[PDB]
Ligand binder design. Structure first.
Ligand SMILES: Nc1ncnc2c1ncn2[C@@H]1O[C@H](CSCC[C@H](N)C(=O)O)[C@@H](O)[C@H]1O
Ligand SMILES: Nc1ncnc2c1ncn2[C@@H]1O[C@H](CSCC[C@H](N)C(=O)O)[C@@H](O)[C@H]1O
Lengths: 256, 256
């Protein structure tokens, strides 16, 4: 979506100058590729001569879309889970590891970051963006607690960032990257604003990211109520008919 | 209040090890001293032998309270405005300048920071905490836009952080500290959670920080409605009868 695009571009444009680029043909990995659109933006950034670029995700519908639309000779689109053990093949395989807007889904944080360290080759670089505090999380968790929906979304799986309510999350993550054994580590917490100029654009997002898969005949009525609690929470401005999201995106830049 | 205390203590405990301490008797300044309670915490942190420690604020009721309760031989409590020109006396006077939770009031940001640089002595250190994104701001601005209060709080002065809606505010401030001419500058944006276990404690805060001075007979009814929009905004949890604030505090550590 627009937010991920804007944040991916802005995150790169800033940190690209700070990267070490090995002279020899490179081995790169992006984690959570989804559409492949954003990982295509990443591939386009410097090294024209690299051996292989790999891009993995959990969604199977997406990896196929992304392999058929963006997949090439040196752009392999695999299915993999970071919350899971690696094959012996991939330990120390990759020179540069990327992952944007993906690591706030992992139940077991340390396992995923421990993997990331093991994938990164000797004298390699990481670059991962990650959501902490985000209103959308509070907006949906608010609906799950509504008198109407309380009972029929009591046991629903609602995936919220592990860091959406943690103090100094930059420090928490920094220490977890030093335990796992990264030599250099830079974790900054970036406050971001994103605006919606009509409600149909905001609605379009809510529909997309909603963590509540339900009957398509309820899907419409559910977001009707979500758009309503968004008015109550002042995520949308009723008078101007606009929406505004201020959220924290932690960006991580580390070497081993 | 509890938040400022907790954040002041936590900010110090972390950054004190990173400070250079001149061997010769020191000249220290805290800006926005208010009660004097917090600036007393600051004075207590290392140097037992300093020449003079000065602590200024705009509130006259407070400077008197703070001078009579906390004021000593080497603890002078002056009235001063940073949004205003300094006397020739104070340019390059102070070895260490502090200011917590104070610089998000200044209409003219660059003037205030330009002052700060001029007060700091040659080869000196700054340490300033500063609010960016804070729900309380959104909570009161929400009330000011209520159908009931819209008209009679149309022209009311509502002091919200200049950075409560800015992207990468750490970068904005960092660049404004390099323009003004600080040699070393470290600006981090720290996400913080603070919890309230009863509503009376949350109410007690709202009453205190409310930017709407009005008849004492309305003051009660106003916060009654603020506590209500706080339920609508999910700042307070209705079922548990608790309140929770997640906010960004930018902490600045610079030398000239
Ligand atoms: N454990 C896991 N390992 C890898 N990918 C995962 C994962 N859990 C979720 N994902 C996937 O990670 C993706 C995050 S969405 C963002 C993808 C991409 N970084 C971008 O900038 O758009 C989703 O496709 C999600 O399904
Ligand atoms: N332009 C200005 N210059 C100096 N102090 C100012 C100011 N505008 C507001 N203040 C004062 O700055 C104080 C900020 S409140 C926090 C004070 C102290 N740093 C603490 O940690 O508690 C208030 O007393 C406010 O009245």
């Amino acid at each position: 979506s627009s937010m991920q695009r804007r944040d991916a571009l802005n995150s790169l444009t800033e940190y690209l100058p700070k990267f070490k680029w090995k002279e020899s043909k490179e081995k790169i990995l992006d984690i959570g590729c989804a559409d492949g659109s954003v990982t295509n933006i990443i591939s386009s950034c410097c090294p024209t001569d690299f051996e292989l670029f790999e891009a993995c995700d959990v969604n199977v519908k997406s990896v196929k879309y992304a392999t058929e639309h963006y997949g090439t000779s040196k752009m392999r689109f695999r299915v993999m889970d970071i919350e899971s053990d690696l094959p012996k093949e991939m330990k120390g395989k990759f020179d540069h590891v990327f992952s944007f807007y993906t690591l706030h889904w992992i139940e077991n944080q340390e396992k995923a970051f421990q993997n990331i360290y093991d994938l990164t080759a000797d004298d390699g670089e990481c670059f991962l963006t990650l959501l902490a505090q985000m209103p959308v999380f509070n907006l949906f968790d608010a609906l799950k607690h509504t008198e109407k929906w309380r009972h029929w979304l009591r046991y629903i799986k609602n995936f919220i960032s592990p860091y959406y309510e943690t103090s100094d999350p930059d420090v928490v993550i920094e220490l977890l990257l030093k335990r796992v054994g990264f030599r250099y580590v830079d974790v900054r917490c970036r406050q971001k604003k994103f605006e919606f100029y009509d409600l149909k654009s905001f609605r379009n997002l809510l529909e997309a990211v909603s963590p509540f898969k339900v009957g398509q005949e309820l899907q419409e009525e559910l977001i009707d109520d979500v758009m309503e609690v968004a008015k109550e929470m002042r995520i949308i401005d009723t008078q101007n008919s606009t929406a505004k999201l201020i959220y924290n995106l932690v960006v991580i830049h580390c070497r081993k």
